[PDB]
Enzyme design. Structure first.
Site, mmCIF file in Angstrom:
data_model
loop_
_atom_site.group_PDB
_atom_site.id
_atom_site.type_symbol
_atom_site.label_atom_id
_atom_site.label_comp_id
_atom_site.label_asym_id
_atom_site.label_seq_id
_atom_site.Cartn_x
_atom_site.Cartn_y
_atom_site.Cartn_z
ATOM 1 N N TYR B 93 0.749 -1.161 0.021
ATOM 2 C CA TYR B 93 -0.179 0.040 0.276
ATOM 3 C C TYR B 93 0.405 0.948 -0.075
ATOM 4 O O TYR B 93 2.117 1.331 -0.588
ATOM 5 C CB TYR B 93 -0.964 0.308 1.015
ATOM 6 C CG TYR B 93 -2.212 1.021 0.514
ATOM 7 C CD1 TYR B 93 -3.005 1.218 -0.018
ATOM 8 C CD2 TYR B 93 -2.144 1.274 2.106
ATOM 9 C CE1 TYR B 93 -4.189 1.981 -0.012
ATOM 10 C CE2 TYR B 93 -3.646 2.182 2.280
ATOM 11 C CZ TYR B 93 -4.576 2.158 0.358
ATOM 12 O OH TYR B 93 -5.054 3.123 0.421
ATOM 13 N N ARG B 146 -6.254 12.528 -7.888
ATOM 14 C CA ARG B 146 -5.560 12.533 -6.279
ATOM 15 C C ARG B 146 -4.730 11.457 -6.034
ATOM 16 O O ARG B 146 -5.335 10.124 -5.077
ATOM 17 C CB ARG B 146 -6.384 13.143 -5.727
ATOM 18 C CG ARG B 146 -5.618 13.913 -4.253
ATOM 19 C CD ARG B 146 -5.747 13.075 -3.295
ATOM 20 N NE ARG B 146 -6.979 13.062 -2.900
ATOM 21 C CZ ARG B 146 -7.025 12.132 -2.036
ATOM 22 N NH1 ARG B 146 -6.585 11.024 -1.038
ATOM 23 N NH2 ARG B 146 -8.543 11.752 -1.611
ATOM 24 N N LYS B 164 -5.012 -2.000 -1.956
ATOM 25 C CA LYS B 164 -5.714 -1.136 -0.988
ATOM 26 C C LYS B 164 -6.807 -2.301 0.054
ATOM 27 O O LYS B 164 -6.728 -3.224 0.644
ATOM 28 C CB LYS B 164 -7.051 -0.087 -0.912
ATOM 29 C CG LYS B 164 -7.775 0.294 0.430
ATOM 30 C CD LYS B 164 -8.368 1.433 0.179
ATOM 31 C CE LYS B 164 -8.827 1.371 1.781
ATOM 32 N NZ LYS B 164 -10.202 2.937 0.570
ATOM 33 N N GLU B 236 -11.710 5.772 -3.565
ATOM 34 C CA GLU B 236 -10.650 5.311 -3.217
ATOM 35 C C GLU B 236 -9.699 6.523 -3.779
ATOM 36 O O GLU B 236 -9.714 5.725 -5.810
ATOM 37 C CB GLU B 236 -9.933 4.371 -2.650
ATOM 38 C CG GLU B 236 -8.277 3.798 -3.033
ATOM 39 C CD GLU B 236 -7.640 4.717 -1.367
ATOM 40 O OE1 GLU B 236 -8.586 5.095 -0.654
ATOM 41 O OE2 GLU B 236 -6.650 4.091 -0.920
ATOM 42 N N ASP B 237 -8.581 7.809 -3.287
ATOM 43 C CA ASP B 237 -8.115 8.736 -4.736
ATOM 44 C C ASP B 237 -8.756 9.068 -5.317
ATOM 45 O O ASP B 237 -8.340 9.436 -6.650
ATOM 46 C CB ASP B 237 -6.965 7.801 -4.930
ATOM 47 C CG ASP B 237 -5.651 7.839 -3.705
ATOM 48 O OD1 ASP B 237 -6.146 8.459 -2.701
ATOM 49 O OD2 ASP B 237 -4.601 6.877 -3.915
ATOM 50 N N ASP B 259 -11.911 7.052 4.039
ATOM 51 C CA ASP B 259 -10.975 7.374 4.402
ATOM 52 C C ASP B 259 -10.559 8.812 4.968
ATOM 53 O O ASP B 259 -9.568 8.996 6.327
ATOM 54 C CB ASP B 259 -9.765 6.255 4.113
ATOM 55 C CG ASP B 259 -10.101 4.809 3.907
ATOM 56 O OD1 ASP B 259 -11.276 4.329 4.724
ATOM 57 O OD2 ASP B 259 -9.633 4.082 2.806
ATOM 58 N N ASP B 260 -10.501 9.180 4.235
ATOM 59 C CA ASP B 260 -9.918 10.873 4.621
ATOM 60 C C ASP B 260 -10.682 11.626 5.669
ATOM 61 O O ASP B 260 -10.490 12.406 6.283
ATOM 62 C CB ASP B 260 -9.881 11.647 3.626
ATOM 63 C CG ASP B 260 -9.053 10.787 2.157
ATOM 64 O OD1 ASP B 260 -7.697 10.897 2.540
ATOM 65 O OD2 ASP B 260 -9.743 10.394 1.742
ATOM 66 N N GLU B 295 -13.624 20.038 4.818
ATOM 67 C CA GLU B 295 -14.541 18.480 5.306
ATOM 68 C C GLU B 295 -14.209 17.671 6.393
ATOM 69 O O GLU B 295 -14.792 17.137 7.548
ATOM 70 C CB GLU B 295 -15.348 18.704 4.524
ATOM 71 C CG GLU B 295 -15.713 19.095 3.168
ATOM 72 C CD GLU B 295 -17.229 20.122 4.060
ATOM 73 O OE1 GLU B 295 -18.071 20.167 3.286
ATOM 74 O OE2 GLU B 295 -17.423 19.801 5.452
ATOM 75 N N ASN B 402 -1.319 14.410 5.623
ATOM 76 C CA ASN B 402 0.116 13.814 3.952
ATOM 77 C C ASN B 402 0.045 14.396 2.843
ATOM 78 O O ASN B 402 -0.912 14.423 2.587
ATOM 79 C CB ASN B 402 -0.411 11.933 4.738
ATOM 80 C CG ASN B 402 -2.085 11.769 3.983
ATOM 81 O OD1 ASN B 402 -2.694 12.434 3.098
ATOM 82 N ND2 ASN B 402 -2.364 11.013 4.243
#
Ligand SMILES: NC(=O)c1ccc[n+]([C@@H]2O[C@H](COP(=O)([O-])OP(=O)(O)OC[C@H]3O[C@@H](n4cnc5c(N)ncnc54)[C@H](O)[C@@H]3O)[C@@H](O)[C@H]2O)c1
Ligand SMILES: NC(=O)c1ccc[n+]([C@@H]2O[C@H](COP(=O)([O-])OP(=O)(O)OC[C@H]3O[C@@H](n4cnc5c(N)ncnc54)[C@H](O)[C@@H]3O)[C@@H](O)[C@H]2O)c1
Ligand SMILES: NC(=O)c1ccc[n+]([C@@H]2O[C@H](COP(=O)([O-])OP(=O)(O)OC[C@H]3O[C@@H](n4cnc5c(N)ncnc54)[C@H](O)[C@@H]3O)[C@@H](O)[C@H]2O)c1
Lengths: 562, 562, 562
Positions: B93, B146, B164, B236-237, B259-260, B295, B402
């Site tokens: 990952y 992203r 993932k 994801e991303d 997750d963010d 957010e 990050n």
């Protein structure tokens, strides 16, 4: 997702269409040239097979033809079965399936179902793992010991679950993938099958030791280990004692019900409710005399008592209205014959006369309803019918023993020795009765196919793990609710078989609505309306398009040069 | 039931064992001669690949090696991954998966996951039907827009879900069958990828019209149509704005979490609870100043407020303890900068000084905790750290942005500009800090892998359809409960990664116990103990015997002569 | 190498054994539980199906039964077919196959063979590529236009190649894999089939334009492109004119022969050689009068002339011994009726009487042999038979037209109007004739199954590309050589059908020995003895063991520690 192409696609009955493969999906799937040039629809195929079927005259030739259709194309098989269901249930299921098993043994070219022998004990799970289908919701198990009207047949009894599973799909809409017919063969007591060198099973007599019980336990455990604890398992045409005690044993820990004890009770209760609508008086006002005190009689009586109780009557007062007549004699308190625990509720203070024969019991008890489930034979003697007609203005006579040769009486004697005012219902089919007066009375047939497909579908859809006794009370009420006012005026006690596929679904809905109401359904979220829930999960016999989705991408930017 | 034999059995990573095929199941399954003569165990295979892996020096060579292992043998891949999980999560990952996507593009020889392009709009369901696996419980979706630390990568972002999903199985025990990685490619804004002729996707720029939203809606509908409404779908991303608004849109009608926003909030709250055990004062006594009002900051603040409320404090009093510092300035009532609805709870009466820079806000508010999620860069200036150390005896500093290049501060400055009394936690990994005093402080790493595998497993096992905000509060409490007393004495805020496979399971249990308590679990019957329930449904990487059950039948009667 | 396991293994007729699967290979191959417990041999299976077959009374029920056996298990099908071949050739092949095609249309559940329609012109190669089998050596092609005794049947004629291919394997030993039945359907002229909505083919009339010829050429090219230039292609039950002109067209460029022109000629010549051994005088001393001057008559006459020439007689002197009687009249030089090129060799200087009817021709020519191949009907009038008996001490009468309704005369009239001294042979079967004198004469049946299986096997084994006219002369000599001295004493002209499986092989050997002698065989190295060559390449119907080879490795050195 269909992973097959070309000839394999036509060798799988699940995906085969025959000539209903359209031209474009013949060419894209590699079937061009392997099929005759004509493009057909399912209607044309059904018509072709229907007339080929009308040309045939014996039921058994029809059976072989229709099972061949099942083996080559299953959607067409179930469409043909649903199109003419009243005329093909006697062919696909009893009585013709027993004749097919007896005479042509194992017609089937494809492997349908598992054969588990007593020689495989300790390794049943490997046999169950040999079955390709990963999700099965209904398992029908046979011993071959008691084929209806044929006796012991051993491995040849394997055709009985198969046929029954067809009804599961033809009436209820259970997916044929989800059905597994099993034959537990522990030998046969049929010496004719033990003598010929072409019998297809073990050449020993039936294992009646603890090894048989251990094999049944191991099979139950293997089936529920692979497929889940809520898998519906039905013991079909086992030995009578074996079936009854297995129902008692596995009722709590497994999802099992019995057609002889529970389905017959539900059908008899539905007939009784229809009769209470036909006659003025309700079920509570009746007095029921049973012929036979076995476990089928006890199941019917318990369901009748539950129905009486739910209508405002007390339990003890309900049980005081049912009288049961054993082979030894009337069940009364203080008789010298042995009475077990389950007949205690229906053992009553003896009447003054203490009748010794059944006709005397009818004369002394003055019962409005008479129900025969003894199975001995023509125990409803003409004197019994005459006494019933004399005592009651409109007697209710139920001859629920099958086959016809074991029925307590036939519709002709029942409707003739009475002036036609009796409401006769029988398990076995009978022809309409015409009298010299000119009227024609059709006897209601208490077919078990009324109850078990709808109940099985409701149990499978709701993820039920324990089928209680009131599920069948709800099924009986649902079956009775299918009758229209004009049908009750004409004196029918059961809905016509011609629309069983509808009746079953309705029954399922009611049972579904019951299971969620009593927290015996484990499929959540609970659907808002149960009718739309069950009607969109039934299996449709219409062909599914196999055409790959071919389209054009919108033009995008050109690839850059190297 | 394994339906394969011979060479196909070794070409399927699910059933392949390599040399762990025992001799008898080499001979019975037709693999003799196709494998080298040696018989090995999974321990020997794992050791061989482990030393081959230690010989390698770059993370990216390790990535290629370990994904090759995944493609040839999945049980061995997950055994190797679980054996050394702390050293191989950075490889499987982030950050190495992003480097692999950027530089080697699509390493994979096998098709893992679906590619859905904007050119396929209106036909997404056919693409979903092309996926062979029939039951998938977790879907991870990427845009490529992203990638963490790499930016836009288009189709090359497909490697991010794959990696993932590996963690899903390596930490939580989700079956690899049940996982589907998807790449929604709508073009790329990366001009380097638009120029070369060997880019593997659409050569257009990113579609930012309504067609993109329609494609996402159609994909969601197709996935839940084939696989069910309770299928877990993770974006994801994606683009940051796109991911946030898609989480808002599909939160109610689908089983999605982020997750963010949610995983980061859970990890930050777990760190805060660990810090409240390390320091004397509880979370309610803290005063939190946020850096950033996005957010992600709002999600963290809402979770902190929920935690404060559940400990006896009122909601308004809880929200009055969190202060948020936007790029424009401190969120106060009456400022000229625009404040939207979601920042209204954390907009407070302005202090007297009305600070204009972040360091001034720290000086004037005297906040005990400082949390940076802005993502701009090194906004935690040395003056900020010095002010925090001066105001608070043991300041709590959280740099949750990050990658490392975007972190608000690094562990070295945080632990040096303070005398070591700060409790520093960061999203990005950092090396241990040694000071001239001689002590060594290891900074707690707020890895998202703490939360999402356990929560995903609990959601998948309980058939949950809507993942609420308090699920992550329960997950944060479960994560904090994994810390021992000695670990808190040493100053760790998170459990070590080396036993993530255990921690995740424990988290799952707690979440499971929550879901059944709040009637958000639809898997019934409800298990009596949730620990034994979840621990027997996790996927084990041990090889399964493929040996056919060969035994001898007991001798029975001889077949009769003809 | 068998790549299947479990249920697929029993759904393939090539690999299916039924109950002949031994227990150990039931357990190792995953068939345990899918089969009934009994373990059987092929002898037991053959006995079961044989008695089930004797129970049946109509030939057509037998046909349906035996083709079902073919569809479920092919080794057992061919074992049953070879066990009772004399009684089952009339069932598997003509005349029962035509009745099956006419009445039950397409019985078959599996796709056997290709259907190529005129609608597929230009795309025949794709249809041929749809056939799964990669090596086929024999192709039998039908039009449906001329079914023997039934007329035009269109697509329903597809059952004719299938049945014929069975004989290819039942008598000669050609692998069933290597056989491909094809139906070229270009419409039907049968208005009954054009009216019903359940006909299985094109609803147009037969295409008699150049499109039909182009389709045949394209099919020939596609078959030889996929399978090779030496693929044996037989046109079966085409239109008479179409079959004859296609034989002329494709004789040189393809490996084709005709049963009506070449097989009939070979069988008639074999009968004539047997008759020349029965009577004192040889074939050269005979004078042959033909009834009919078609291409079948010309083929028979050319073969007879070749046989006469090889025995020392000149070609012109040989042709002067054959006289041919057309419908118009006797073929003589200077008659007003048109005579084409192929009848020029057998057009002779007219006799003095110049006969106008056939009986007058018999009286004036005094011919020893009379051969009827006209096909009109009972043209061998009783006066003709009486004249033959009066002129010749032992007349030879050949009624080679079929079916029985088209035969020139029946055995009863031939053997009764003569005192039994005639040597009668017919294509159609006839019962033995008993006379008032007490003797019983069985007429020799000129079955085409004598020639085509052995010749086909020899051609397939030798990789022959052009089947010449002397191949059938060698086949006729081989067939005659099968008769023993006692058989000739009893007056048989052909070997009994009961050992056709032997006779065919012997024929093959001779043809093989001829093909290598005349450099028309392209399979090298040339075998030293042709008998052992052909007898080890025939297909055996015995079951092949599917048991995986399971053994123990000798103990070797222990693996070193890590
Ligand atoms: N081409 C295909 O084979 C295909 C296509 C679509 C769906 N499916 C199947 O549909 C199933 C989806 O399950 P669900 O979420 O709708 O369950 P559900 O929630 O609707 O019903 C609950 C239980 O009843 C079972 N069930 C539902 N309908 C049934 C029926 N007509 N007959 C017998 N059992 C039935 C279900 O398998 C389930 O276990 C998948 O297992 C999938 O394999 C198969
Ligand atoms: N050799 C095999 O492939 C094999 C063998 C045994 C069982 N199974 C599978 O086990 C399943 C039985 O389902 P169940 O009754 O135990 O469900 P369950 O009641 O135990 O759990 C509820 C839901 O969680 C899913 N789930 C359970 N464990 C999971 C895991 N480790 N990872 C991801 N999802 C998980 C289940 O599919 C189910 O939908 C069958 O679908 C069957 O296909 C497969
Ligand atoms: N289990 C199996 O399927 C299996 C096993 C062994 C061999 N084979 C086949 O044997 C063939 C070997 O060919 P060969 O070298 O022996 O040819 P060959 O030299 O012996 O004979 C020459 C030609 O005659 C063909 N032929 C041989 N016997 C035949 C028969 N009984 N029926 C129809 N055609 C026949 C051959 O295919 C060949 O083209 C392989 O193609 C292989 O596919 C198959």
């Amino acid at each position: 997702h269909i992973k097959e192409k070309g000839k394999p696609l036509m060798l799988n009955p699940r995906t085969n269409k025959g000539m209903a493969f359209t031209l474009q999906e013949r060419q894209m799937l590699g079937l061009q040239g392997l099929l005759p040039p004509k493009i057909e629809t399912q209607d044309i195929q059904a018509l072709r097979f229907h007339r080929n079927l009308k040309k045939m005259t014996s039921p058994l030739e029809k059976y072989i033809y229709i099972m061949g259709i099942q083996e080559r194309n299953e959607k067409l098989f179930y469409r043909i079965l649903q199109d003419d269901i009243e005329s093909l249930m006697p062919i696909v299921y009893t009585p013709t399936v027993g004749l097919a098993c007896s005479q042509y043994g194992h017609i089937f070219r494809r492997p349908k179902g598992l054969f588990i022998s007593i020689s495989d004990r300790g390794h049943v799970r490997s046999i169950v793992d040999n079955w390709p289908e990963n999700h099965v919701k209904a398992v029908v198990v046979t011993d071959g010991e008691r084929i209806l009207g044929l006796g012991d047949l051993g491995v040849y009894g394997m055709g009985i679950p198969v046929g029954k599973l067809c009804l599961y799909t033809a009436c209820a809409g259970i997916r044929p993938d989800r059905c597994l017919p099993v034959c537990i063969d522990v030998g046969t007591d049929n010496i004719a099958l033990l003598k010929d060198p072409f019998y297809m099973g073990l050449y020993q007599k039936r294992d009646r030791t603890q090894q048989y019980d251990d094999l049944i336990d191991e099979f139950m455990k293997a089936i529920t280990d692979r497929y889940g604890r809520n898998t519906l398992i039905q013991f079909e045409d086992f030995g009578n004692h074996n079936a009854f005690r297995f129902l008692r044993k596995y009722r709590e820990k497994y999802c099992t019900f019995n057609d002889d004890i529970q389905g017959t009770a539900a059908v008899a209760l539905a007939g009784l409710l229809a009769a209470q609508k036909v006659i003025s008086k309700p079920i509570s006002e009746h007095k029921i005399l049973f012929l036979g005190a076995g476990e089928a009689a006890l199941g019917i009586a318990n369901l009748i008592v539950m129905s009486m109780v739910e209508n405002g009557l007390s339990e003890q007062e309900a049980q005081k209205k049912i009288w049961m007549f054993d082979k030894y004699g009337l069940l009364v308190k203080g008789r010298k014959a042995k009475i077990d625990s389950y007949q205690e509720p229906f053992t009553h203070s003896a009447p003054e006369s203490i009748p010794d024969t059944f006709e005397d019991a009818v004369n002394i008890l003055k019962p409005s309803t008479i129900i025969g489930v003894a199975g001995a034979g023509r125990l409803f003697t003409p004197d019994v019918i005459r006494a019933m007609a004399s005592i009651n203005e409109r007697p209710v006579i139920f001859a629920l023993s099958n086959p016809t040769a074991q029925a307590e009486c036939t519709a002709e004697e029942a409707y003739t020795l009475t002036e036609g005012r009796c409401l006769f219902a029988s398990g076995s089919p009978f022809g309409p009765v015409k009298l010299t007066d000119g009227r024609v009375f059709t006897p209601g047939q208490g077919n078990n196919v009324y109850i078990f497909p709808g109940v099985a579908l409701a149990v499978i859809l709701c993820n039920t793990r324990h089928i209680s006794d009131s599920v069948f009370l709800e099924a009986a009420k649902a079956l009775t609710s299918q009758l229209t006012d004009e049908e009750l005026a004409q004196g029918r006690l059961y809905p016509p078989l011609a629309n069983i596929q509808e009746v079953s679904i309705n029954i399922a809905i009611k049972v579904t609505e019951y299971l969620y109401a009593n927290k015996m359904a484990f499929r959540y979220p609970e659907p808002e309306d149960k009718a739309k829930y069950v009607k969109e999960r039934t299996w449709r016999s219409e062909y599914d398009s196999l055409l790959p989705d071919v389209y054009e991408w919108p033009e995008s930017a050109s690839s850059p040069p190297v």
